[PDB]
Design a binder for this molecule. Structure first.
Ligand SMILES: COc1ccc2nc(C)c(O[C@@H]3C[C@H]4C(=O)N[C@]5(C(=O)NS(=O)(=O)C6(C)CC6)C[C@H]5/C=C\CCCCC[C@H](NC(=O)O[C@H](C)C(F)(F)F)C(=O)N4C3)nc2c1
Ligand SMILES: [Zn+2]
Length: 198
């Protein structure tokens, strides 16, 4: 019935991957109860910092990455949802189900990565656990893990960046290619596909 129809909450920033120093580490900035309230109101007054955010809905958690002033993530995590912000829910500025891609304006206080123009195939995937995983680029949207590991270790890191040696954004992690549960390769949205969408 129309009177009873519910509304999905906003995506909420709950933490970040700190890459500012010599050591990468995950930081939590909001716990589960506060995340639930913030998702319902869409009002998040917490200060945002950094390039890689940890984000959550009521049912999923994943990453989002700021590149060129846009906070990018995956459609299979965010759907068409707003993101919470100090002034309330912010509507997506980009949505492309065909690429598994969404984006919102980057939050005030975030730092954006620069799109890579290096043409390098020696990449680094940053996970929600702040693992920095060497990946050899194998195509426009594929890379192979130099050290394979169970898909468990990658779960929840969609939306995270692949970086070049110089720290530029090369792509957004989308899916894991697995054999008997072991991730040998990753599928990602290249930054040129983002720069086209822009
Ligand atoms: C609804 O509209 C949509 C539009 C386009 C779309 N497009 C894609 C490609 C898609 O793929 C789904 C979701 C991702 C995934 O799980 N993403 C990571 C992740 O961490 N998610 S997450 O953060 O936990 C989560 C779920 C909260 C958000 C990065 C994965 C980590 C571990 C793998 C776990 C087993 C899964 C192995 C899968 N492999 C795979 O399909 O491989 C093939 C061969 C491909 F061609 F894609 F490579 C895989 O990775 N999938 C399967 N759904 C959609 C949906
Ligand atoms: Zn580069």
């Amino acid at each position: 019935h129309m009177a009873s129809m519910k509304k999905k909450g906003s995506v909420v920033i709950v933490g970040r991957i700190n890459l500012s120093g010599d050591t990468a580490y995950a930081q939590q900035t909001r716990g589960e109860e506060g995340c639930q309230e913030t998702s319902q109101t869409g009002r998040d007054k917490n200060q945002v910092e950094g390039e890689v955010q940890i984000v959550s809905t009521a049912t999923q958690t994943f990453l989002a990455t700021s590149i060129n002033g846009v906070l990018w993530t995956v459609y299979h995590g965010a759907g068409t949802r707003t993101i919470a912000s100090p002034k309330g829910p912010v509507t997506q500025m980009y949505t492309n189900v065909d690429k598994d891609l969404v984006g919102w304006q980057a939050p005030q206080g975030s730092r954006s990565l620069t799109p890579c123009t290096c043409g390098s195939s020696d990449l680094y995937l940053v996970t929600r656990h702040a693992d920095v995983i060497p990946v050899r680029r194998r195509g426009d949207s594929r890379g192979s893990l130099l050290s394979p590991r169970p898909i468990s270790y990658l779960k929840g890191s969609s939306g995270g960046p692949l970086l070049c040696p110089a720290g530029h954004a090369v792509g957004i992690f989308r899916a894991a290619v697995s054999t008997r549960g072991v991730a040998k390769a990753v599928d990602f949205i290249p930054v040129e596909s983002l720069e086209t969408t822009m």
